Symmetry: C3
Subunit: 307 residues, 3 copies
Amino acid sequence: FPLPTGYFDIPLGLAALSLAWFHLENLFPAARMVSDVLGIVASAVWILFILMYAYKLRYYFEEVRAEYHSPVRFSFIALIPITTMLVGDILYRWNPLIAEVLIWIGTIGQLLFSTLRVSELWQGGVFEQKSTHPSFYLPAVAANFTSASSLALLGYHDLGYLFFGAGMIAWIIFEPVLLQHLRISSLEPQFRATMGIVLAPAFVCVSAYLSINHGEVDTLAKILWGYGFLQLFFLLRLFPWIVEKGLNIGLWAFSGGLASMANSATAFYHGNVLQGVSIFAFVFSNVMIGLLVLMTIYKLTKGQFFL
Amino acid sequence: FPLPTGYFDIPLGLAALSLAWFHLENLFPAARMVSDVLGIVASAVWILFILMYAYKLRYYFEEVRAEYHSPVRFSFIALIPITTMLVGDILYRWNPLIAEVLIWIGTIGQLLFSTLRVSELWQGGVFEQKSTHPSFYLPAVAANFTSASSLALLGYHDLGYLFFGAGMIAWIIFEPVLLQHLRISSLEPQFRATMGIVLAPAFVCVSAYLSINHGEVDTLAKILWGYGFLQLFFLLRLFPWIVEKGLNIGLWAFSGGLASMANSATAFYHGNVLQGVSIFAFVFSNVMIGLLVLMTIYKLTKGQFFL
Amino acid sequence: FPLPTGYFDIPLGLAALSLAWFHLENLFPAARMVSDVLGIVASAVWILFILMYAYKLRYYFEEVRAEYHSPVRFSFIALIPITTMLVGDILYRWNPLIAEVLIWIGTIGQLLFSTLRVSELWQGGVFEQKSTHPSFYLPAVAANFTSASSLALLGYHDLGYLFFGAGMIAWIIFEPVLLQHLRISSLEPQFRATMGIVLAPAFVCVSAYLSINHGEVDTLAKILWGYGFLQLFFLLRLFPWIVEKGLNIGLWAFSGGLASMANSATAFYHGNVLQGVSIFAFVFSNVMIGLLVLMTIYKLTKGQFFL
Ligand SMILES: CCCCCCCCO[C@@H]1O[C@H](CO)[C@@H](O)[C@H](O)[C@H]1O
Ligand SMILES: CCCCCCCCO[C@@H]1O[C@H](CO)[C@@H](O)[C@H](O)[C@H]1O
Ligand SMILES: CCCCCCCCO[C@@H]1O[C@H](CO)[C@@H](O)[C@H](O)[C@H]1O
Ligand SMILES: CCCCCCCCO[C@@H]1O[C@H](CO)[C@@H](O)[C@H](O)[C@H]1O
Ligand SMILES: CCCCCCCCO[C@@H]1O[C@H](CO)[C@@H](O)[C@H](O)[C@H]1O
Ligand SMILES: CCCCCCCCO[C@@H]1O[C@H](CO)[C@@H](O)[C@H](O)[C@H]1O
Ligand SMILES: CCCCCCCCO[C@@H]1O[C@H](CO)[C@@H](O)[C@H](O)[C@H]1O
Ligand SMILES: CCCCCCCCO[C@@H]1O[C@H](CO)[C@@H](O)[C@H](O)[C@H]1O
Ligand SMILES: CCCCCCCCO[C@@H]1O[C@H](CO)[C@@H](O)[C@H](O)[C@H]1O
Ligand SMILES: CCCCCCCCO[C@@H]1O[C@H](CO)[C@@H](O)[C@H](O)[C@H]1O
Ligand SMILES: CCCCCCCCO[C@@H]1O[C@H](CO)[C@@H](O)[C@H](O)[C@H]1O
Ligand SMILES: CCCCCCCCO[C@@H]1O[C@H](CO)[C@@H](O)[C@H](O)[C@H]1O
């Protein structure tokens, strides 16, 4: 099937950057235009990708079956509901009713998804030590942070805090065994682009947190940013090793983290906290996601995108 | 010996539900009656069980010796001081002086217990990977949350926060390796009823927290509830697997978690936060502990309770 | 080479105790004298030790090379920048300009150090399960807490909170796998003195936190203290096992934790919170670091300090 599930990272990353620029509108009006263009690109890619995936469910169902049951690959499916909610969040600026349908479909879906599949891992005997990949953050952690921000947007803040709490504690509970496994075993080259997901948790956390708490940059938020930057420096240093066997579309896995860096940076800028670190983060993230776009345009014009 | 240490889960669960109903008195006066009846049942079962256990110490001491030294079974002993404190908490409504004796005996006991036994595990060579069971939450985590709430009740809030902090950080520090071990190895049928303890931490946490912080439902509390509900959904889905080889009195291990669900729910209802989720949680927990009571009455009348 | 890297624990511990006494000046003026004497001793030992280590870099460079690459021994190098910052903090009372040079050198150094070396562990294949030692807290956790407090002192509170957050979350993320490894494997006698580092995190955490947050003893701070005392009781009980094969200069590894116990205790005393527990902690820590000094004076006069 020509569409790898992982490619939902593309509208994921583009949609989150849209939302990041959106929060700048009231400081710099031209940011709205930029926010709108990214949101439209992201929504169109999401529509294309949802229709391709429906095509897969219908005619390549065994391949979805097998990725669903894999203790490793099941995770990427969580990107479907996540981008669904993020597109819904973009659309809210134009049609709050369609946005809310999309947000609930995505929230119910991810919750149902993790309850069915993540819990089942606890029966033992299928997940193995080498199953301890960064992609596990998706169903467990990123899905919940996205429901939390998206439900806040619709005015459900208390409900938002529940899903936030689920994401935050799930993250702290998984990372310990992940980092220990990387230390000991690490990852073979073909999985290494997924190290980009390791960037995500702190930054997606604080961005979701600031969405629910009215943009108030407090101690918790500063604390998350600190640890976010620590992981960024580590990943920067690791980058040559990560792309040891070459650059590839898998690198879109950094995009959710990078985009949350941009988003959180806008909140910090608004609240007048580390404004310089903010400008740096926002510009850095944008340039990098920009490089991902240029490399994806390159591959599209060398017939090397789809399978 | 006819009394398994695990059976202290019974007055544990009944006592915590008593305390849960107690907090409803000022919204609905008939809740006091219900709180009192459960507290009396719980206290009577606790007296019976304490006298049976003293009997074991005296005439079956090798069996206590061996459970004490087991890296797995030592944990259930922590239920003795825990229920001791909870009974003390019930009794406070009638006799604050006896309640405080019981609360200090239970606090000193659990602290002394964990300091002697839990620390010793760090000498290595006795605890094994397959020793990573949910029952380890008892000495480490539940004991401390119970001291914290119980010491708050007597007016020692700052002292309460120390034990709370010990419980909360101990929990976050153990769960990561527990969940990883369940993923990989899981648990054989005879230990599976102890999955019910996994429900407990978030809910016992927030309940203890609300006891110390004057019932103020804040961000931390909402965060804990979110993760509590995530684990509930997982455990619900896992339930058929949990009771694969049949229903049994071991299922009383859910009761501390269920009861803390009820207790925290009353605090949330009072503070006007997610009142509907609150009614659901309170009713759910009560029905389930109610089912545990009916199944225990059933077994008592088939001579299948004691050994 | 006559100086083991670990011996930087000596000025580390002495410098942190200096800072602890410093905070008592405004309650009890004679504490300044005591603070100054310790700070001078600590600074002189630090100068001696820095010059010995420069000597090692220059003429014994292969030995630094090999300790740098060890997945276990690399950690102790982090003590160089840590004590550098702490000496800088002492000196601030006399010369704020030299203090700030030292603080930035130490912050840039530790950050650069961890980014180069700690991240590299994630390439796998060098760090092993038996590499899971308490010394790993140094580069990861203690280095960051020291930058955070030291940058607060110079007036950079928001920057302080970033490094604090990095330390705090790094700690919670490592301890889980550490404690599990001690439970299963523990440590051979020659590494056991490093159990003293396990005392450090909660107490260094809360001390750094109180430095940044203006000494305000809040819920988070009480929570950290609770868990700090839990680990203290465990370590007390473990002590005979720790010194099974004899007392040795390695025991200076407790000194950062003990000194942070003293420091945090002063903040708690000021804010009128658990003042009695505070007096106990302050006196306890001082007596113990005092015993370490007497045993070090003893060994110095038996020619059994340097190699
Ligand atoms: C979007 C992701 C879709 C998930 C596809 C799920 C595969 C379901 O799993 C299957 O379903 C059958 C019953 O329905 C089972 O009995 C099969 O044994 C099992 O393979
Ligand atoms: C894309 C997000 C929505 C979730 C869709 C997945 C539906 C799961 O499918 C389920 O797979 C199970 C195994 O866990 C089967 O046993 C069940 O019959 C089936 O309901
Ligand atoms: C695991 C990481 C969790 C870090 C805990 C967050 C610290 C909470 O910070 C708190 O909230 C307010 C925010 O300005 C402060 O006023 C409070 O005094 C402080 O306790
Ligand atoms: C998330 C960070 C993005 C916000 C970027 C805006 C940077 C604008 O730059 C700032 O403009 C100010 C006035 O508007 C000037 O006075 C500042 O000195 C200048 O740095
Ligand atoms: C309520 C739980 C009671 C715990 C029973 C503890 C068993 C103690 O342990 C024992 O104690 C002896 C000394 O007292 C030791 O020397 C024995 O070796 C050891 O087995
Ligand atoms: C029920 C809660 C109270 C705690 C009672 C347990 C007392 C522990 O018993 C102890 O066992 C040790 C091993 O750890 C022995 O070495 C000690 O001699 C003994 O004091
Ligand atoms: C590991 C899980 C810890 C979650 C951290 C709790 C977040 C603390 O929440 C804090 O406390 C107050 C409560 O309303 C808020 O005002 C503060 O602004 C916020 O920082
Ligand atoms: C922990 C939750 C338990 C509290 C349960 C009480 C539910 C009562 O029900 C509520 O009564 C209100 C008035 O008292 C009505 O006005 C509400 O609409 C009704 O929902
Ligand atoms: C204060 C601690 C100093 C760290 C000493 C670092 C050892 C560096 O590591 C080395 O550096 C060379 C290049 O510079 C490498 O190519 C060598 O392979 C590698 O051994
Ligand atoms: C004492 C704190 C300051 C940090 C000094 C250490 C400098 C690291 O040295 C580095 O070692 C690398 C391997 O990780 C080599 O590959 C690099 O060439 C070298 O830059
Ligand atoms: C992992 C351990 C983290 C513990 C979380 C800290 C709890 C934060 O405590 C918070 O900050 C203020 C401090 O007085 C309170 O007012 C807030 O109401 C409370 O949420
Ligand atoms: C970190 C704790 C160190 C502070 C130690 C000072 C202890 C002094 O002691 C206190 O002095 C008070 C007046 O100053 C008396 O009134 C108190 O009762 C007495 O306990």
